[PDB]
A paper describes a structure:
Brd4‐BD1 contains three tryptophans, yielding a total of nine signals. In the following, we show that, in the case of Brd4‐BD1 ligand complexes, the CH‐groups of Trp81 are sensitive reporters for favorable CH–π contacts and can be easily monitored with 2D 1H‐13C HSQC NMR experiments. In order to provide a comprehensive assessment, we selected a set of 13 ligands for which both crystal structures and affinity data were available.
Reversible binding of ligand 1 to Brd4‐BD1 leads to the loss of all three Trp81 1H‐13C signals, a pronounced case of conformational‐exchange‐induced line broadening due to a substantial structural rearrangement of the tryptophan side‐chain. Although seemingly disappointing, this observation might help with clustering ligands according to their mode of binding.
Numbering used by the authors: 42 to 166
Write the structure that this text describes.
């Protein structure tokens, strides 16, 4: 029981575009969360073996992390801003599913999610 391959970060059959919303997602949303004191546990895929998380990939079938989101934004993988927002939502939700209220990682995820919500509220129209 080890880790799956990380999520894809490049799709060569998918066209690429730069938009004002995608710029905001990289330059404000991802950058702010990535640089936060609590970001390190979320900067790469969950390594259930190194972290001793039994049954992680029996419980979480749609893993996501900020390292994947950063690479997707840097590679212009996202065509729609909603794809990126959905990945951040999946990352936080998985943490809440696997862990318990009051756990250190959940309190860290909640602080990052509050900051995510504050920044996404100012996504340009
Ligand atoms: C995402 C996601 N979803 N569930 C989990 C469950 C655990 C983790 C996790 C926790 C970590 O540290 C703990 C908060 C303390 C124990 N050791 C310390 O140094 C502090 C990590 C420290 C360095 C790198 N990666 C970590 C990943 C992330 N998780």
């Amino acid at each position: 029981s080890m880790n799956p391959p990380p999520p894809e970060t490049s799709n060569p059959n998918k066209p690429k575009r730069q938009t004002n919303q995608l710029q905001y997602l990289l330059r404000v949303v991802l950058k702010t969360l990535w640089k936060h004191q609590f970001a390190w546990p979320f900067q790469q895929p969950v390594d259930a073996v190194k972290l001793n998380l039994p049954d992680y990939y029996k419980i979480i079938k749609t893993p996501m992390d900020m390292g994947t989101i950063k690479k997707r934004l840097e590679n212009n993988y996202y065509w729609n801003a909603q794809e990126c927002i959905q990945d951040f939502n999946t990352m936080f939700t998985n943490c809440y599913i696997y862990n318990k209220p009051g756990d250190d990682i959940v309190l860290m995820a909640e602080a990052l999610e509050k900051l995510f919500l504050q920044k996404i509220n100012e996504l340009p129209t």
